[PDB]
Amino acid sequence: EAVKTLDGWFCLHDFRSIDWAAWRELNPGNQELMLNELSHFLSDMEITKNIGEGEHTIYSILGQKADLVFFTLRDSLEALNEVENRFNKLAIADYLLPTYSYISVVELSNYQNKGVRARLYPALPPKKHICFYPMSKKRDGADNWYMLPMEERQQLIRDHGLIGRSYAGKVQQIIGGSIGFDDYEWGVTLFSDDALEFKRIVTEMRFDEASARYAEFGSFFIGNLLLSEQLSKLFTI
Amino acid sequence: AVKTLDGWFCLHDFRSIDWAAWRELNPGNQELMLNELSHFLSDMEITKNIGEGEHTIYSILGQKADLVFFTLRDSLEALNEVENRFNKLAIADYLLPTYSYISVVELSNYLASHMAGGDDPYQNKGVRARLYPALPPKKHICFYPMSKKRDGADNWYMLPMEERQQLIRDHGLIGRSYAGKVQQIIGGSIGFDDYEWGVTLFSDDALEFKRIVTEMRFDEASARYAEFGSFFIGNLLLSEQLSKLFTI
Amino acid sequence: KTLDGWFCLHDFRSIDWAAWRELNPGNQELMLNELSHFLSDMEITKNIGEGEHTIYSILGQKADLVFFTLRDSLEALNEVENRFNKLAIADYLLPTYSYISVVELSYQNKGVRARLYPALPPKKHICFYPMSKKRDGADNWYMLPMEERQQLIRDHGLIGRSYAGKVQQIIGGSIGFDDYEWGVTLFSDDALEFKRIVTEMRFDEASARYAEFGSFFIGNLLLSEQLSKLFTI
Amino acid sequence: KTLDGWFCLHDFRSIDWAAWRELNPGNQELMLNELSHFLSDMEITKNIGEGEHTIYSILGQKADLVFFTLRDSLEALNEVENRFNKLAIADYLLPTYSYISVVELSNYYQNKGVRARLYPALPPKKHICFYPMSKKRDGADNWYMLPMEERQQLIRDHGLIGRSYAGKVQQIIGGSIGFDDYEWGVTLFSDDALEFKRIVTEMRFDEASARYAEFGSFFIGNLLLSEQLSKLFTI
């Protein structure tokens, strides 16, 4: 009955809110020193990306939930843990307050193939916007995904995939499985150059039976790509 | 599935004033920080006057917040830039974040907003007035997020289109009967925030908020399918009310 | 259809004893003097008929105090709240919960005016809780026909009548104003009457099937003398 | 319809070890001496029959301690709480949970057995368990819509289970409708903490709880007398 999956990079979505009042009290020399240290840290992460042993990206997040998200991908939980711990020990991380995080593993569901590696070990597209949310499938009375027969679940998933293929080109998705790893069953990351495409795809999916009857959603987070020019601007008072 | 037209991107930014810290500042430094906020708001008025957005400020009742800054912009980048420049104001260290909401002004296709045809609605001036709304200087504001239920036999997203259309139609008749008393902005937020809409109401009589929201609650579209978040109520704040608000 | 009266704020505060303790007694006195001035201001509004207010000490950790204020506009209620937060002593009164509502009765009449603009009785104890009516499957209050709801509300009223002289109730409507649909304040000289009336109502179908409750707060009347004792440390 | 006895406060605190550690030992001793005089005053009220109190250390992060106090009026209880909060040492006792209730005897004052239950002597048992609970009002599982006779029978069967733990678990049931966020506060005392797991598990398979009980958080701890109270605070 159970789904069986292929699993790739381990993923951390690390959401931070900048402690502006504390940062503002810092002398501008201390600020520059801490950003230089962060800049070294990110150069090291770019080395790891270039040799194909992981990926990362940063977006600035709208609203009070976070000021930015660091999305990091590594080939082991140990390498992910080490990134996280070294990040937290940067001087600047004292000003980056933790507001939410998500742990997952890139997931390919069964419902060396170079086209499988490309999904399991995803290169992150440098799209203008990111959208992140976690979700689970419902187990609530007669709306119970995990009691459905495989044939009915397969049909529901087929219909859901038709919708998403129509947003190919517009929206790129990474699906992280998180059963056993975090509080929901998947972490969904979308990338697009038009944020309204996130609204469009997620709305269209909500009226398809697989989500209409069986999806449970967490919080949603949207943001704008942060390269270095925008990163240094972010922190300049 | 519903199709939407989408207009300005919206931020409702709720803040609580840290009176104890503010009180520790001498009045010289308080004036300097208020001067910097006025310059900031003057810049926001320029953006409004060139047609690139809108904004307004209300004082909020109760402990949820002291102020809401409601800002509308033509891109997420611009909205993000307002937010970030605002947090970097000196006075913002005394404006503690207590809640926020991201949405986009939305017109659905459940009913018609313009004569059908090849003519695209974004060129219709009546449609544009609704997608890119002028904010009215009404005495009061009411904000709350909401979603439509997906709960056993009460599942909005499993209804056929013609049934959702009828429910929305009937909801709209109620709303139309508050013309000239309540003005509404509906921001869609599927994909953007934690509920599916952010609802902003404006009225000169706060009791009209209770009236319409109560009346709609006995209409099937809300009685059976609405799920509500927190409600925020407040009073219009112009310059006079603002320097006054911060005089301790 | 409802008639609406004074706008209401329930403002719950926990006292920051650690910081209050750090103040020398002279500065404590100055802050209490300012607070007494503010409260005498509130009493003036009461005595001219433009509002009401009362203060109860709250049991348990949810709060030390509740300030229950009633005013004739949202602007006036907002001004009181803001002037309150600007008192020096308010820096030691940490906000832990609040509720906004309007006195509700479903205007030239004296007994109606007495309901819509209620005098606050100096009863020994207070009980506050918000509530809503369920919209949950077959237990959906707002999908009931008019005549069924009327019968359900009728029966709940008979229970209330039996507590005349034991419990006095103020019902604030809060649809559009706060997170629940009503704020319920009860006053009695015997706190056990709160438990009795609220239990009795819970077995009545209007509440048994359709009530959804928030947190409950219970307290003892604070006059000027008990206020000075509260803060003596 | 119920009989109601002492009003009850369960006051849960976590100790601010970092701040406590900054105090020099003479000041630490002065604050503990003040707490000693406060507790000896509480012992007078206990000795004269006007209330009760006990202290347990609580396992896990929810709390380090619970102060469980019973008084014959809400005013007396409020006065205990406020005086406690104004102790110097209370700055180091951070509030993490509390519960207000009244000792309750349903029908599902001059009598000596009734009085022993309404105004209960607290047993010096090694362990305490506290949790609040309410009865469900959820579709077909609605306690408050049940006929009186059906409720009577469900309570009867529940009481039979409780009777079988006589001599192992002693219970205080506090009614809290109108007073706090659930409908009852449940306090269990036993010298064997596994008896808590046993009695609460067995009740959960009895219809009265299986269908109708809604539980809050659970707290368990160990009796703190004077000997253990000083050691708790010694760094």
Place this chain on the structure above:
Amino acid sequence: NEAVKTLDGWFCLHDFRSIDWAAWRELNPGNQELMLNELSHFLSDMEITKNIGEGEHTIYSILGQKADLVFFTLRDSLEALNEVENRFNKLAIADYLLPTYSYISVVELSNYLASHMAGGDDPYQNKGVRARLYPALPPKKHICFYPMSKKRDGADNWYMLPMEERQQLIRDHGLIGRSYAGKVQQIIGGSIGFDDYEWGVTLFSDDALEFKRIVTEMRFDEASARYAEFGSFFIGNLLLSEQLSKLFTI
């Protein structure tokens, strides 16, 4: 109707902590060392209790913001467990270890299935049973923790089911778990009466993906599909003395 009966072993604490890096950064290295020396002395005291058979303990670093560390401690009484917790909080370094979550439970063996022959013997004298009630912790690379309860929700009410139906559901769940022998080791802590859910579940494995595999497969089995209510999930990596010193080096 017929309640489950259990055998109960060591009392357990899962103690999750987040490191206050900002504060720790402000200490000079000599004072950091003294605090780590004192911690190493406390852990060697824990090791002594392990080596005389009166408890167990282990430390994992936790991924994500929920915690940096979990200290999982097992002891033969609630008093001993409470004494360990209190001595830990009074370490100097514990000021830098902020509490983010905890769980209290007791190693549980229920009677849904047999754990030993019904020949009249004291189960607590059966060494196989003792190995389960007083479990040696395996030094597996990864840990997974989550609490859970069984639903009492309308037609999905575990506690209204007949004994023989619950036994069938537990039996089927066990066959799935049996298939992960050698890949995932489980400790089930019962927590009815002790904490906010009904069990705390700890999984150990050298491959973190086996956690996802077993939890997913059980979620399609009726016992969980229909009746499980889950809390938060925590996953982590084994921390020995060496990885601990690195964790705290800035």
